[PDB]
Design a protein around this nucleic acid. Structure first.
Lengths: 178, 128, 259
RNA sequence: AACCUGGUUGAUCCUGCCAGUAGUCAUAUGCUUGUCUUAAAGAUUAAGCCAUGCAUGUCUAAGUAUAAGCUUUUAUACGGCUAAACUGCGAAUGGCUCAUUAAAACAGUUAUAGUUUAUUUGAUGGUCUACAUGGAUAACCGUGGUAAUUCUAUGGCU
RNA sequence: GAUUCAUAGUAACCGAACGGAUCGCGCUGCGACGGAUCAUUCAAGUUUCUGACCUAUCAGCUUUCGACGGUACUGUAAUGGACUACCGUGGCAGUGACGGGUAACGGGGAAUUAGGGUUCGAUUCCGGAGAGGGAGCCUGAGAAACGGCUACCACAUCUAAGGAAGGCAGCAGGCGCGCAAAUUACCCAAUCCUGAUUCAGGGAGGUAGUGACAAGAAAUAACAACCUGGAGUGAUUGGAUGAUAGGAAUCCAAACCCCUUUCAGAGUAACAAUUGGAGGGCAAGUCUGGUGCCAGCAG
RNA sequence: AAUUCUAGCAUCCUUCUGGACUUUUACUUUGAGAAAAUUAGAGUGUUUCAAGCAGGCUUGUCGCCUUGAAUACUCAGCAUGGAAUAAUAAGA
């Protein structure tokens, strides 16, 4: 009845059990500090939208007015998102993307890359416990993905102990208790 | 803790005898802003006569806190503001006391009984 | 079935109003001078274009002041179909709005001068003899002007006076006369008329040429003569009905938003 | 991701199915369940059957006021405000369901020189006691009938 | 594009239709209502062409009682075998007529990871049909109406036994069918609609409750110092956010949730993650007890 | 200069001032008209995201961006440029 669209962000692979596949996915969990195999398949699916878009465009012709429009819009996203570097703007380059390029751009890594978090796991806990101001307002969610002008901007939230606020609750219990 | 006011989307509306605009407000430290405190500050900004001309609604604090934004609507006179504005918006402010009506189910049960009696029907009013 | 439908639904509304999907199950339903899908009701001007009203309630509170007029006449109904080339006049503010088609294919109230807001154009649907052997035009608006010139034929516009009833300035329908499109794919585009094909049976079509030398076609029902070969009786909206390209409309828009 | 593994033989290469695997923004069902956002839900079989309550009514300066109604202003036809009732308009929209139905319906595409159209918008029109024609009907008052209903009769006004 | 069209003219016809016996604010303005013809608009009725699932263990259908056509009525809002008189003998079919089946309303669409396809579409929009089964009809611009009426049939209510009234495939709710589906809740505030209408009404519609049908995000820990040494372990102590419970303001038609900020709020972080497997296919133990072609597993 | 399209000249119509003739279609090209929702898709930090169609600048007050909400998609039917291919017609 209600006019609300909805979609599925991921889908499971055809083979359940392959030692080639399970090993290479487990590295991506171990590097970037992920909860479960759905978080990989999300990005697996998200790439294949962008990849199948370029695969459709690249078959045609460089002077065709569909490709010059829809290509330049797609390349703007990859430059904005910090996914493809700006030195190469060819549509061909989008194909040479991998899942490691997307997973380095999410906020788990860009905290750690920043280095405030120290360790991949710690960085996820800092995000979820209401620290880390991205731009103007604070962000609670690991799978954010940063737009490259915004990346310098990540900093501890004004509120909170790292930030310069009330020291949570447990430090007060020690301080008032003593 | 105080707050910083800064309006947006202003539209002077002489047909309706009122000015409409989104407020935007910045409040580091403080948790939210009450409308009784906001209507005092927006009065002295806009150089108004009477608080009762002004009426204010919406106000979501954004995610994180510090920032918030809402709607507002400065009339001229309170008597013009009482006419054109619906009563529920005024009531939160408290300019006008709430009107105690009877229930919707109770009112419906009168008129179906009122169908059955022709002639003088007004004995059904006291009977219900 | 069984009679005329009193409701219209959102989504089943016209797209060129640009009523949203949420925030209502139904949409306002406009019968008046103009058709349902070749008009826009007076509510969605006030709330969803001009931004005077917030709600459907507030439009009743505006219109029952008797502040809104159209064609120097007060229309009290909130769901009155105000269509192509109608003047709107509000006395408070002292500003007037002639409704034209935007280049994208939308209604927009184009603001105009006080002396210009007297007159308006009406393209004649046909010409026909009434009783006592008197001649009579009929318009797209559904007016019926009577005692014209013998000059005036079908498919051409006449400047009405409005302050008085009578006609003032004719126009002819020929090659080298300015012409806006009112419907179909090429709506909101204005160009000189190159040529028309006859096709003796049904549906005459006209090829015509934009001021940047783009050539495009429409049926004669959609075509609406403004004025002479270059120049125009009326004031035009933003872009003057060029309709620049898809990549151009991208480039101009994102260049704007960076400020 | 334009994908393939197990099973006929002492063993091999085939045809060939069976089984495995994955999806459903498809139902049902088992065990488990901390949080917030959005949200399908008596379709499948019984278009089977229904207690009770509710879902269609409506008044403006502008059709008709002698409530034996109200209200302070005090009006020789009529101060306003209004129950009730007559008149007008609506009730043919909306909502629900899928049993019918296979060039039927429906879809896109014509035609109406083969026609009706409340309303809206714009036109038109002296040509047939004229300082004003007629008599009944509610509500209301008096009064009954019937076990019982949105049953209503006789009598008197306008 | 095209007429016997518009329109004018001539000769008469009928009453069965218009040419205002109406109302408010203020020699004179404004608009409320009524009604005729002509456009106009919201429509509706017919109508051209093309398009569909299975079935030939359905091959010949249609007709004197309209089947195909012709003339002249009649009837309709108008065109028509739509209907009636006479007259002709046609029309459709192997490119599937006629008949049967559908666990068949049609389409816009949905699922399905090359391309081509296959299956689904009761269900948000647009048509269509129906209000237990059939049929008939009044009023009106419009209905063969069912929250209108008349009748039969099938169910069923009250009766003082003469009679009277009923139609939830509207919203809740109940019985019954089943593998299979929610509250007899609050309000017109939003969205629109009807009316004599700025004001009244609306189970249309919206808000809440039930809700692992479904879609999205992501807790169940992190970091230190103090054995394996070529970064991982080790309940060894150690100090550093919401689940929850109650305020504040905000939201709301009135509650409620979200988002803010608040006093309390974890050390086997007892605030304890389960569901299926471990011969092969299929990722993962020639482990240890019990059972002995038994019980059972096993797609 | 490649790649498009087009006028002439090797004997190439004309009735006029764009259409009539070239047998007829299919085919292909461009164009008309065809509701939205859904689908792909332009733009935009709903905190991310599924979504949604919003927003964004700013001590200025007839606020501005003469604000955005693009566009595609929708056999048979109507129209049109064209030299092949294939039907089809014919045979002053």
């Amino acid at each position: 009845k209600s006019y609300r669209t909805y979609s599925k962000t991921a889908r499971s692979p055809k083979r359940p059990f392959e030692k080639e596949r399970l090993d290479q996915e487990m590295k991506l969990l171990g590097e970037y500090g992920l909860k479960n195999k759905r978080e990989v398949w999300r990005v697996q699916y998200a790439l294949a939208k962008i990849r199948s878009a370029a695969r459709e465009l690249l078959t045609l012709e460089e002077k065709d007015p569909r490709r010059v429009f829809q290509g330049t819009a797609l390349l703007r996203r990859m430059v904005r998102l910090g996914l493809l570097g700006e030195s190469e703007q060819k549509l061909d380059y989008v194909l040479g993307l991998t899942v490691a390029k997307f997973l380095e751009r999410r906020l788990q890594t860009k905290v750690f890359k920043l280095g405030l978090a120290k360790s991949i796991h710690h960085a996820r806990v800092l995000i979820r416990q209401r620290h880390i101001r991205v731009g103007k307002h604070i962000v609670d969610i690991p799978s954010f993905m940063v737009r490259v002008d915004s990346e310098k901007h990540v900093d501890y939230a004004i509120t909170s102990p790292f930030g310069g606020g009330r020291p949570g609750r447990v430090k007060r219990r020690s301080l008032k208790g003593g | 803790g105080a707050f910083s006011l800064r309006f947006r989307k202003l539209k002077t509306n002489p047909l309706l005898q009122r000015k409409q605009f989104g407020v935007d407000i910045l409040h580091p430290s403080r948790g939210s802003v009450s409308k009784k405190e906001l209507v005092e500050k927006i009065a002295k900004q806009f150089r108004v006569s009477d608080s009762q001309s002004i009426v204010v609604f919406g106000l979501k604090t954004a995610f994180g806190g510090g920032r918030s934004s809402g709607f507002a609507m400065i009339y001229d006179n309170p008597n013009a503001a009482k006419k054109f504005e619906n009563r529920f918006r005024l009531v939160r402010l408290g300019y006008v006391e709430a009107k105690p009506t009877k229930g919707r189910r109770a009112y419906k049960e009168l008129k179906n009984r009122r169908k059955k009696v022709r002639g003088k029907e007004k004995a059904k009013c006291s009977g219900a | 079935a069984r009679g005329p439908r009193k409701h219209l639904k959102r989504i089943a509304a016209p797209h060129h109003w640009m009523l949203d999907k949420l925030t209502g199950h139904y949409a306002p339903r406009p019968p008046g001078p103009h058709k349902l899908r070749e008009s826009a009701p007076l509510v969605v001007l006030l709330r969803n274009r001009l931004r005077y009203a917030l709600t459907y309630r507030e439009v009743m509170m505006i219109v029952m002041q008797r502040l809104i007029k159209v064609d120097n006449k007060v229309r009290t109904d909130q769901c009155y179909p105000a269509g192509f080339m109608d003047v709107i006049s509000i006395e408070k503010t002292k500003e007037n709005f002639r409704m034209l088609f935007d280049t994208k294919g939308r209604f927009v109230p184009h603001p105009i001068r006080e002396e210009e807001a007297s007159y308006k154009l009406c393209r004649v649907k046909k010409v026909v003899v009434g009783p006592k052997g008197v001649p009579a035009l009929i318009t797209h608006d559904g007016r019926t002007m009577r005692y014209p010139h013998p000059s005036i034929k079908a498919h051409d516009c006449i400047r009405l006076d409005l302050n008085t009833g009578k006609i003032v300035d004719t126009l002819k329908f020929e090659a080298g006369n300015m012409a806006m499109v009112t419907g179909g794919h090429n709506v909101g585009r204005v160009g000189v008329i190159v040529h028309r094909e006859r096709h003796l049976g049904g549906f005459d079509i006209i090829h015509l040429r934009d001021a940047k030398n783009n050539e495009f076609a429409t049926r004669i029902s959609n075509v609406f003569v403004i004025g002479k070969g270059e120049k125009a009786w009326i004031s035009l909206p933003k872009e003057k009905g060029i309709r620049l390209s898809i990549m151009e409309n991208r480039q101009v828009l994102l260049k704007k938003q960076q400020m």
